[PDB]
Scaffold this motif. Structure first.
Motif, PDB file in Angstrom:
ATOM      1  N   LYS A 136       0.844  -1.182   0.000  1.00 39.83           N
ATOM      2  CA  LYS A 136       0.000   0.000   0.000  1.00 39.83           C
ATOM      3  C   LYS A 136       0.890   1.246   0.000  1.00 39.83           C
ATOM      4  O   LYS A 136       0.678   2.212  -0.705  1.00 39.83           O
ATOM      5  N   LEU A 137       1.943   1.178   0.779  1.00 38.44           N
ATOM      6  CA  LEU A 137       2.852   2.250   0.782  1.00 38.44           C
ATOM      7  C   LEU A 137       3.507   2.437  -0.608  1.00 38.44           C
ATOM      8  O   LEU A 137       3.725   3.574  -1.055  1.00 38.44           O
ATOM      9  N   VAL A 190       2.846   5.669  -3.804  1.00 35.85           N
ATOM     10  CA  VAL A 190       3.846   6.380  -4.549  1.00 35.85           C
ATOM     11  C   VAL A 190       3.896   5.961  -6.022  1.00 35.85           C
ATOM     12  O   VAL A 190       4.849   6.266  -6.728  1.00 35.85           O
ATOM     13  N   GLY A 191       2.850   5.312  -6.522  1.00 36.44           N
ATOM     14  CA  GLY A 191       2.759   5.040  -7.957  1.00 36.44           C
ATOM     15  C   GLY A 191       3.139   3.632  -8.437  1.00 36.44           C
ATOM     16  O   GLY A 191       3.147   3.374  -9.638  1.00 36.44           O
ATOM     17  N   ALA A 192       3.452   2.721  -7.526  1.00 30.57           N
ATOM     18  CA  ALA A 192       3.802   1.364  -7.883  1.00 30.57           C
ATOM     19  C   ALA A 192       2.537   0.659  -8.353  1.00 30.57           C
ATOM     20  O   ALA A 192       1.483   0.781  -7.712  1.00 30.57           O
ATOM     21  N   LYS A 244      15.483  -4.004  -5.882  1.00 36.99           N
ATOM     22  CA  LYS A 244      15.832  -2.661  -6.402  1.00 36.99           C
ATOM     23  C   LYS A 244      14.572  -1.822  -6.580  1.00 36.99           C
ATOM     24  O   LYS A 244      14.556  -0.689  -6.165  1.00 36.99           O
ATOM     25  N   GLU A 245      13.519  -2.368  -7.181  1.00 36.16           N
ATOM     26  CA  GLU A 245      12.311  -1.575  -7.431  1.00 36.16           C
ATOM     27  C   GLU A 245      11.696  -1.150  -6.117  1.00 36.16           C
ATOM     28  O   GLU A 245      11.163  -0.051  -6.017  1.00 36.16           O
ATOM     29  N   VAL A 246      11.746  -2.030  -5.127  1.00 32.98           N
ATOM     30  CA  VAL A 246      11.109  -1.720  -3.852  1.00 32.98           C
ATOM     31  C   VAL A 246      11.819  -0.502  -3.214  1.00 32.98           C
ATOM     32  O   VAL A 246      11.163   0.460  -2.748  1.00 32.98           O
ATOM     33  N   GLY A 286      12.473   5.114  -1.626  1.00 36.45           N
ATOM     34  CA  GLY A 286      13.215   6.408  -1.708  1.00 36.45           C
ATOM     35  C   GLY A 286      12.254   7.514  -2.082  1.00 36.45           C
ATOM     36  O   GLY A 286      12.248   8.581  -1.490  1.00 36.45           O
ATOM     37  N   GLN A 287      11.398   7.232  -3.048  1.00 42.60           N
ATOM     38  CA  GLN A 287      10.415   8.185  -3.448  1.00 42.60           C
ATOM     39  C   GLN A 287       9.474   8.613  -2.343  1.00 42.60           C
ATOM     40  O   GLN A 287       9.222   9.792  -2.192  1.00 42.60           O
ATOM     41  N   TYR A 288       8.947   7.650  -1.613  1.00 44.19           N
ATOM     42  CA  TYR A 288       8.076   7.892  -0.477  1.00 44.19           C
ATOM     43  C   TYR A 288       8.753   8.724   0.614  1.00 44.19           C
ATOM     44  O   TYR A 288       8.207   9.666   1.111  1.00 44.19           O
TER      45      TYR A 288
END
Ligand SMILES: O=C(O)CCC(=O)NCCCCCCOC(=O)c1[nH]c2cc(Cl)ccc2c1-c1c(-c2ccc(F)cc2)ncn1Cc1ccc(Cl)cc1
Ligand SMILES: O=C(O)CCC(=O)NCCCCCCOC(=O)c1[nH]c2cc(Cl)ccc2c1-c1c(-c2ccc(F)cc2)ncn1Cc1ccc(Cl)cc1
Lengths: 95, 94
Positions: free
Chosen positions: A20-21, A25-27, A35-37, A42-44
């Motif tokens: 959910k988090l 942020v757009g996931a 890496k994607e996580v 980082g974005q969040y």
């Protein structure tokens, strides 16, 4: 360097709270490499300004969804292994 | 190594259920390295014979305390990172 790149490519399925988090942020996916996580986390952190303005490598996640997941009030973005571990606790690795 | 040497020395504090399980095969302490936790889990799996007789690298933990801790019905013992992940969910790092 700190984490081998093979491990960064580890395929994973975040548990609901973490997912959910990432979605906030757009996931879009239900499965990710580590890496994607990390990118999305980082974005969040950046968009919620969880980093400390004065010491920008320190993240204050206390009283935030992120701190509920990580179970610490703050952490250094320089300690990669600790961070991976805190994230591992919030997911399943996929076969 | 799929698990770096230093990750094996990580100091950890098992949650109550995992600690019950470790104590059932003789664990004395309340905090451990990940290496020690794995050792005791290895003995648990061997004593309860959760490994498959035919395919001895597969553990069937379904319907056992272990499977309830790990959240899977079986797993292979060659999948080290999966295993560390399943364990980490059942403890707090010191
Ligand atoms: O001027 C200086 O002294 C420092 C400038 C500098 O070195 N670097 C700029 C930072 C690059 C940031 C973009 C890419 O970073 C990430 O995607 C990233 N994702 C994260 C997730 C968590 Cl839970 C924590 C930190 C980061 C993070 C990041 C951050 C970061 C810091 C504050 C912030 F608000 C967001 C990201 N800085 C470095 N990184 C790289 C990184 C990657 C993986 C891991 Cl386990 C740890 C760190
Ligand atoms: O060539 C062959 O036929 C196979 C021969 C072979 O190589 N046998 C070696 C067996 C050595 C067992 C001694 C050390 O193992 C452990 O302490 C250990 N602990 C574990 C905990 C879990 Cl949750 C799962 C597996 C094991 C395990 C074990 C086992 C094992 C297999 C079946 C069983 F009933 C008990 C242990 N085999 C290897 N290992 C080593 C190991 C260590 C860490 C990790 Cl993440 C994974 C594996």
């Amino acid at each position: 360097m700190q984490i081998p790149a093979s491990e960064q490519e580890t395929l994973v399925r975040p548990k609901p709270l973490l997912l959910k988090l990432l979605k906030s942020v757009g996931a879009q996916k239900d499965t990710y490499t580590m890496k994607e996580v990390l990118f999305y986390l980082g974005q969040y952190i950046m968009t919620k300004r969880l980093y400390d303005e004065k010491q920008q490598h320190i993240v204050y996640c206390s009283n935030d969804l992120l701190g509920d997941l990580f179970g610490v009030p703050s952490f250094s973005v320089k300690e990669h292994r600790k961070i991976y571990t805190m994230i591992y606790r919030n997911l399943v690795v996929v076969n």
